[PDB]
Design an enzyme around this catalytic site. Structure first.
Site, PDB file in Angstrom:
ATOM      1  CG  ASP B  25      -1.776   1.120   1.328  1.00 27.76           C
ATOM      2  OD1 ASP B  25      -1.826   1.903   0.471  1.00 27.76           O
ATOM      3  OD2 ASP B  25      -2.764   0.965   1.948  1.00 27.76           O
ATOM      4  CB  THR B  26       2.404   3.151  -2.717  1.00 30.68           C
ATOM      5  OG1 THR B  26       0.887   3.275  -3.537  1.00 30.68           O
ATOM      6  CG2 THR B  26       3.204   2.217  -3.492  1.00 30.68           C
ATOM      7  N   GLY B  27      -0.202   4.031  -0.481  1.00 29.16           N
ATOM      8  CA  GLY B  27      -0.774   5.246   0.265  1.00 29.16           C
ATOM      9  C   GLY B  27      -0.667   5.332   1.510  1.00 29.16           C
TER      10      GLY B  27
HETATM   11  C1  LIG Z   1     -10.905   4.097  -2.292  1.00 25.07           C
HETATM   12  C2  LIG Z   1     -10.316   4.318  -1.324  1.00 25.07           C
HETATM   13  C3  LIG Z   1      -8.979   5.110  -0.981  1.00 25.07           C
HETATM   14  C4  LIG Z   1     -10.670   3.210  -0.152  1.00 25.07           C
HETATM   15  N1  LIG Z   1      -9.362   2.331   0.248  1.00 25.07           N
HETATM   16  C5  LIG Z   1      -8.769   2.467   1.348  1.00 25.07           C
HETATM   17  O1  LIG Z   1      -8.835   3.327   2.144  1.00 25.07           O
HETATM   18  C6  LIG Z   1      -7.495   1.497   1.403  1.00 25.07           C
HETATM   19  N2  LIG Z   1      -6.431   1.927   2.016  1.00 25.07           N
HETATM   20  C7  LIG Z   1      -5.560   3.021   1.487  1.00 25.07           C
HETATM   21  O2  LIG Z   1      -6.001   3.206   0.266  1.00 25.07           O
HETATM   22  C8  LIG Z   1      -4.416   3.584   1.980  1.00 25.07           C
HETATM   23  O3  LIG Z   1      -3.495   3.795   1.248  1.00 25.07           O
HETATM   24  C9  LIG Z   1      -4.830   4.777   2.750  1.00 25.07           C
HETATM   25  C10 LIG Z   1      -4.960   5.977   1.823  1.00 25.07           C
HETATM   26  C11 LIG Z   1      -5.409   7.287   2.654  1.00 25.07           C
HETATM   27  C12 LIG Z   1      -4.488   8.223   2.827  1.00 25.07           C
HETATM   28  C13 LIG Z   1      -4.885   9.504   3.462  1.00 25.07           C
HETATM   29  C14 LIG Z   1      -6.086   9.686   4.033  1.00 25.07           C
HETATM   30  C15 LIG Z   1      -7.323   8.749   3.797  1.00 25.07           C
HETATM   31  C16 LIG Z   1      -6.771   7.569   3.125  1.00 25.07           C
HETATM   32  N3  LIG Z   1      -4.255   5.257   3.967  1.00 25.07           N
HETATM   33  C17 LIG Z   1      -4.617   4.937   5.274  1.00 25.07           C
HETATM   34  O4  LIG Z   1      -5.778   4.561   5.416  1.00 25.07           O
HETATM   35  C18 LIG Z   1      -3.594   5.223   6.466  1.00 25.07           C
HETATM   36  O5  LIG Z   1      -2.204   5.437   5.957  1.00 25.07           O
HETATM   37  C19 LIG Z   1      -1.340   6.053   7.068  1.00 25.07           C
HETATM   38  C20 LIG Z   1      -1.264   7.580   6.723  1.00 25.07           C
HETATM   39  C21 LIG Z   1      -1.810   8.206   5.546  1.00 25.07           C
HETATM   40  C22 LIG Z   1      -0.634   8.170   7.529  1.00 25.07           C
HETATM   41  C23 LIG Z   1       0.043   7.218   8.624  1.00 25.07           C
HETATM   42  N4  LIG Z   1       1.091   7.922   9.520  1.00 25.07           N
HETATM   43  C24 LIG Z   1      -0.222   6.046   8.629  1.00 25.07           C
HETATM   44  C25 LIG Z   1      -1.018   5.324   7.854  1.00 25.07           C
HETATM   45  C26 LIG Z   1      -1.246   3.982   7.803  1.00 25.07           C
HETATM   46  C27 LIG Z   1      -6.224   1.625   3.312  1.00 25.07           C
HETATM   47  S1  LIG Z   1      -7.369   0.618   4.030  1.00 25.07           S
HETATM   48  C28 LIG Z   1      -7.656   0.291   2.370  1.00 25.07           C
HETATM   49  C29 LIG Z   1      -9.161  -0.125   2.050  1.00 25.07           C
HETATM   50  C30 LIG Z   1      -6.737  -0.793   1.761  1.00 25.07           C
END
Ligand SMILES: C=C(C)CNC(=O)[C@H]1N(C(=O)[C@@H](O)[C@H](Cc2ccccc2)NC(=O)COc2c(C)cc(N)cc2C)CSC1(C)C
Lengths: 99, 99
Positions: B25-27
């Site tokens: 997960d690069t996000g």
């Molecule tokens: C369409 C979508 C974005 C829904 N999908 C999702 O949310 C999927 N995820 C993703 O797509 C992830 O990359 C997300 C993206 C994101 C970043 C900032 C604000 C909000 C969301 N990241 C996160 O939920 C949290 O990421 C972190 C961040 C942004 C900061 C810190 N310090 C630590 C973490 C773990 C993690 S849960 C998942 C279901 C695998």
């Protein structure tokens, strides 16, 4: 390009005639952008992850330019904390993870 | 390897002698794993995702294998919807995004 992961992989996108910054997010199935106008019909969707779900508007057949690479696909619009380019558009620009 | 994004980039990890599935997960800045027991002391952290924030337990210097690649680093434990390998560990395994 080759983008390292020491910092967040942010790029400039062009969408709906607007420039935005967005995160290249391999963890996201879908692409979700902060509130903006887009053309065409839409339908509501719920997307979830850490912290639960948010309600978004789903627009289909949207173009988009991501770091200079065009494509077309579905774009979700709503109260995302971060603009996110998800896999549905990462595939189209030819993005892979390599190690 | 070269991992394409037509499907979720799921891999097997090993943590605590056990195999688990996780998402590259690069996000995600950090690595978040579902409830499990890890050794040592932990510190509190809050992380914000698409739906809001969750509280997690931060464990440092944890031995973890990701798709066969050895890493030793910080692992957050808490109510994540899926196990997430974030940039802190993607950098240890030498991962880049490429297009
Ligand atoms: C369409 C979508 C974005 C829904 N999908 C999702 O949310 C999927 N995820 C993703 O797509 C992830 O990359 C997300 C993206 C994101 C970043 C900032 C604000 C909000 C969301 N990241 C996160 O939920 C949290 O990421 C972190 C961040 C942004 C900061 C810190 N310090 C630590 C973490 C773990 C993690 S849960 C998942 C279901 C695998």
């Amino acid at each position: 390009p080759q983008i390292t992961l020491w910092k967040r992989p942010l790029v400039t996108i062009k969408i709906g005639g607007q420039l935005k910054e967005a995160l290249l997010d391999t963890g996201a199935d879908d692409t979700v952008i902060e509130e903006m106008s887009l053309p065409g019909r839409w339908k509501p969707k719920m997307i979830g992850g850490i912290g639960g779900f948010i309600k978004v508007r789903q627009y289909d057949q949207i173009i988009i330019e991501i770091a200079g690479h065009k494509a077309i696909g579905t774009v979700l619009v709503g109260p995302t904390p971060v603009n996110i380019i998800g896999r549905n558009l990462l595939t189209q620009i030819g993005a892979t993870l390599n190690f």
